[PDB]
Amino acid sequence: KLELRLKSPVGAEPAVYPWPLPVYDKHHDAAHEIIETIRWVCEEIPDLKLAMDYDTKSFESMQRLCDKYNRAIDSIHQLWKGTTQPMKLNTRPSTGLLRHILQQVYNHSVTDPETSFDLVAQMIDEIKMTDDDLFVDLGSGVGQVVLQVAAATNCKHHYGVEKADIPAKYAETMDREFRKWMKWYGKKHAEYTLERGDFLSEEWRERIANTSVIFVNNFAFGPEVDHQLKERFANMKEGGRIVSSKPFAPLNFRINSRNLSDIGTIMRVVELSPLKGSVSWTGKPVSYYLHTIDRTILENYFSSLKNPKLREEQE
Ligand SMILES: CC(C)N(CCCNC(=O)Nc1ccc(C(C)(C)C)cc1)C[C@H]1O[C@@H](n2cnc3c(N)ncnc32)[C@H](O)[C@@H]1O
Numbered sequence: 001k002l003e004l005r006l007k008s009p010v011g012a013e014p015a016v017y018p019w020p021l022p023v024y025d026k027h028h029d030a031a032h033e034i035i036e037t038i039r040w041v042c043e044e045i046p047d048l049k050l051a052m053d054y055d056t057k058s059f060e061s062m063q064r065l066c067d068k069y070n071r072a073i074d075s076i077h078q079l080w081k082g083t084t085q086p087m088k089l090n091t092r093p094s095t096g097l098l099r100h101i102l103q104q105v106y107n108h109s110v111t112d113p114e115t116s117f118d119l120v121a122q123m124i125d126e127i128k129m130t131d132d133d134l135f136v137d138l139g140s141g142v143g144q145v146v147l148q149v150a151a152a153t154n155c156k157h158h159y160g161v162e163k164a165d166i167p168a169k170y171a172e173t174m175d176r177e178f179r180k181w182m183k184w185y186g187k188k189h190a191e192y193t194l195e196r197g198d199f200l201s202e203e204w205r206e207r208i209a210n211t212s213v214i215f216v217n218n219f220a221f222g223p224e225v226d227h228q229l230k231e232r233f234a235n236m237k238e239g240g241r242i243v244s245s246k247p248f249a250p251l252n253f254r255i256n257s258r259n260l261s262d263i264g265t266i267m268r269v270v271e272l273s274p275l276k277g278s279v280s281w282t283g284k285p286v287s288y289y290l291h292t293i294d295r296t297i298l299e300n301y302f303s304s305l306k307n308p309k310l311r312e313e314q315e
Contacts (some may be wrong), residue, residue, distance in 0.1 A: 002059060004019060105174055136159045155190055211238075
């Protein structure tokens with residue numbers, strides 16, 4: 001049992017990798033996870049970076065990297081017992097670190113098969129959230145978007161619902177791995193829960209109604225599903241928000257007597273700035289749509305109906 005070990009910068013149990021190092025997929029292996037972990041822990045701790053071309057296929061070369069990191073850590077834990085203040089323990093991971101952490105968790109969780117990551121990141125920055133908010137990802141897969149958002153924001157709670165057996169199972173793991181690795185790096189996340197469920201179900205009806213921020217990746221959703229979703233969103237509170245990959249109402253909705261009951265009567269819809277250098281499987285750059293529950297649109301229309309002048313114009 002030849003092995004490599006990395007010490008936690010905050011004294012959690014060490015990460016232990018068997019030799020020879022496992023490959024995760026055609027683009028990810030333990031070797032580079034190790035290397036990358038070291039680089040990121042160095043970003044967490046400037047002194048560690050100060051204190052610190054490799055052959056990822058030589059055990060001795062890789063052990064010289066680990067020992068060197070591990071000694072630098074010991075040395076840093078000593079420095080903190082002195083007057084130097086330890087790394088503050090309650091912080092959120094930088095975006096960079098979070099990217100690594102999520103890659104790492106994926107690798108250790110999903111054993112059989114994240115440009116989204118960058119998009120989600122853009123959305124986290126545009127969509128201000130606070131401790132008032134409840135976030136849900138509808139059709140949450142293995143959970144990566146809940147985890148990312150839960151790591152980055154103050155929402156009071158974050159949920160993901162997913163109905164298929166496979167992804168839901170991985171999600172149970174992704175949850176354990178995530179908490180484990182976040183403890184390893186000494187970072188906080190907001191509360192979250194990843195659940196099995198169908199978000200079209202009667203329980204979810206009320207839950208959708210009380211959620212203030214919904215992400216849903218509905219591009220390939222069919223008419224029936226998008227329509228059922230519209231009927232769920234109709235019950236949401238003023239200022240509720242939905243971010244999606246396909247808009248649930250037209251962007252220039254003009255309210256009139258034929259379309260009174262359409263969901264565009266009750267929501268502002270905007271196209272969100274795309275991410276430069278993004279390109280979907282289609283070939284077109286990726287755009288995203290923000291809907292904000294705003295029932296003043298319907299109010300003003302009905303006001304207008306009462307005003308004979310404004311009534312004639314329309315008419
Ligand atoms: C492709 C989507 C939908 N989703 C998985 C995607 C993983 N999560 C995201 O990608 N979130 C996200 C990403 C980007 C944005 C932006 C901000 C718009 C860019 C917003 C949200 C399919 C999963 O839904 C389940 N699923 C499908 N239908 C249901 C259902 N009816 N009930 C429960 N789960 C369902 C399926 O079983 C499948 O497991």
